[PDB]
Amino acid sequence: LVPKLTASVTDGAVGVTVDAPVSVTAADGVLAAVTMVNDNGRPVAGRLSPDGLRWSTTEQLGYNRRYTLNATALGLGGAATRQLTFQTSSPAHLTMPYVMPGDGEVVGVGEPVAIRFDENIADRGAAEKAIKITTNPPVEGAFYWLNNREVRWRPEHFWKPGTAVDVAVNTYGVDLGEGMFGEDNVQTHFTIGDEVIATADDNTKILTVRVNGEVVKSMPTSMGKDSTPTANGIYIVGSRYKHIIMDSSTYGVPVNSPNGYRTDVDWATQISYSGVFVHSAPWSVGAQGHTNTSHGCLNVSPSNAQWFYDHVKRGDIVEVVNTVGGTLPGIDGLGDWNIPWDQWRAGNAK
Ligand SMILES: *C(=O)[C@@H]([C@@H]1N=C(C(=O)O)[C@H](Sc2c[nH]c3ccccc23)[C@@H]1C)[C@H](C)O
């Protein structure tokens, strides 16, 4: 019997995707030599199996390449040689994904998986299928898009403390629609820490911090005045700042417009993309616990703001109740939990 050569690609092929390695296998014989070179002649890194039956590329294959594969199989029954030339995907565009939270970070029970592309994604389903989420203990979750570039993944309920979460965004070589391909793969891993939920009740004007169910802090607060109220609902804690200049035009509002502003504040914890913060407000300490005076922020004392900075982490939860405002938008950026599970689970890939 003459040896048989079988490659993972065909000699005519074009649009060969680079999301997977190229391989060659021998039957009724072993692989004596396999080389693969690109256009100019540079050989691709590859390794042969110990039993000599299978060879495969070991480095990343490039977009817009013309590769030529040469293989020889030897067996008792004789020899066989093949030569194959193929062309890989040529993207009209590349997009790079960015993942949050950071690798190795410990976050609160409200932290969603966040994958943000630097380009609009024409084929949302293709992107979702390219993203592998591992959870331990395993929990059901689903993808939901906040906009054309950023997709979120979360369970039905807040994470259980101690849960490991692994995120592999494998979009290299993947057609993301309209000739858009992934620029590279990214992978992050994070862990869920203590359950921290802080509740702001407009009926008491108190911000109560509960850690695993126990009250550890009760902060008098001043929230949004009736003119610019604080929206009710569930807020996810984002970034924290020892100090930050608060610019209204960052959130749409022109600085010298009626409800515009530019002020420098201390100990600020962001809880919405729309610009709601927990922060130090020495000017309204008399009002805190009594009357709402803010532009929507949860004003607290300088001491309590620093405490919040020190003790609350990314992914922890702030819940606002009983204000004269509406409900925080589900697609705010930190308002994901306000979307009903039935709607989130359904997703919006189409
Ligand atoms: C949140 O409300 C808002 C942020 N929080 C501030 C506040 O104190 O309400 C400022 S605006 C302000 C209103 N009265 C003041 C007196 C002295 C100094 C500043 C202010 C600022 C708008 C978010 C972050 O935009």
Curated annotation (Swiss-Prot):
Domain L,D-TPase catalytic: 196-321
Family annotation (InterPro entries): Big_10 (IPR041280), LD-transpeptidase (IPR050979), LD_TPept_cat_dom (IPR005490), Transpep_catalytic_dom (IPR038063)
Sequence positions that bind substrate: 261, 274-275, 299
Cellular component GO terms, alphabetical: plasma membrane
Compartments where located: Cell membrane
Entry note about domains: Consists of two tandem immunoglobulin-like Big_5 domains in the N-terminal region (residues 56-145 and 150-250), followed by a L,D-transpeptidase catalytic domain (residues 251-378) and a C-terminal tail (residues 379-408).
Summary of the function given for this chain in its UniProt record: Generates 3->3 cross-links in peptidoglycan, catalyzing the cleavage of the mDap(3)-D-Ala(4) bond of a tetrapeptide donor stem and the formation of a bond between the carbonyl of mDap(3) of the donor stem and the side chain of mDap(3) of the acceptor stem. Is specific for donor substrates containing a stem tetrapeptide since it cannot use pentapeptide stems.
The name this protein goes by in its record: L,D-transpeptidase 2
